[PDB]
Amino acid sequence: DQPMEEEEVETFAFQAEIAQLMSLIINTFYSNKEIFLRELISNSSDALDKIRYESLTDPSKLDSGKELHINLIPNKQDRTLTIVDTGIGMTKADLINNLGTIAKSGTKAFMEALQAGADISMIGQFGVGFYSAYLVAEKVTVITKHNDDEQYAWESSAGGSFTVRTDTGEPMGRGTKVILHLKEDQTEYLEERRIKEIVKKHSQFIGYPITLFVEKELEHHH
Ligand SMILES: COc1cc(-c2nc(C)nc3[nH]cc(C#N)c23)c(Cl)cc1Cl
Description:
Blueprint: E1 10-13, H1 16-27, H2 35-55, E2 70-75, E3 80-85, H3 92-101, H4 105-115, E4 137-145, E5 151-156, E6 161-166, E7 175-182, H5 192-202, E8 210-212
Binding site for ATP: 43, 85, 104, 130
Family: Belongs to the heat shock protein 90 family.
Protein name: Heat shock protein HSP 90-alpha
């Protein structure tokens, strides 16, 4: 009897300082947790800047999709908030290198800044704004697709490790999805009014379309 599907999953340890940062963030009380969304939208914008730049000299970079935009997708039934972009995306090595195993100077520097009295909202200036996701999320899943490459899924609940595997669910043309599985007391970020006010307040200068898709699984059809 054959399995419908089978795939290899790799588990990697976070570099020490990244593990420390994630513990501080996911565990500590902060009054301004809404900044996570700003940080994630900012990273999407950067990724969109990148594919756009590459396409300037090689238009075929956009064969996997010309539209450059950001989508925000609250799903109250799954208790997830997903941010999707059609940016450059990442290779498997990119995921492993850039989301856990190699620490930049900004990781330690940021924690030093916080100890010296800085605010968590500054996190983006240290290049680690992604991890601010764990202010509101207990688990984060990153689905990503780069040109000429397969679709991969990265995931961590911040236990000091993350997994990587091939994603065969729903094929993306190109880009990245960051799926936040929200903490039970952070479900306000699934509400339309909350998402809208946070984007209005913090992402006014993002130069790409940002579009809300309110997701609901229709009855008897989950
Ligand atoms: C600079 O540091 C990071 C960047 C990205 C990232 N990279 C690319 C190519 N696209 C993205 N879209 C949304 C993202 C987010 N968040 C994102 C991630 Cl997932 C983690 C880190 Cl630590």
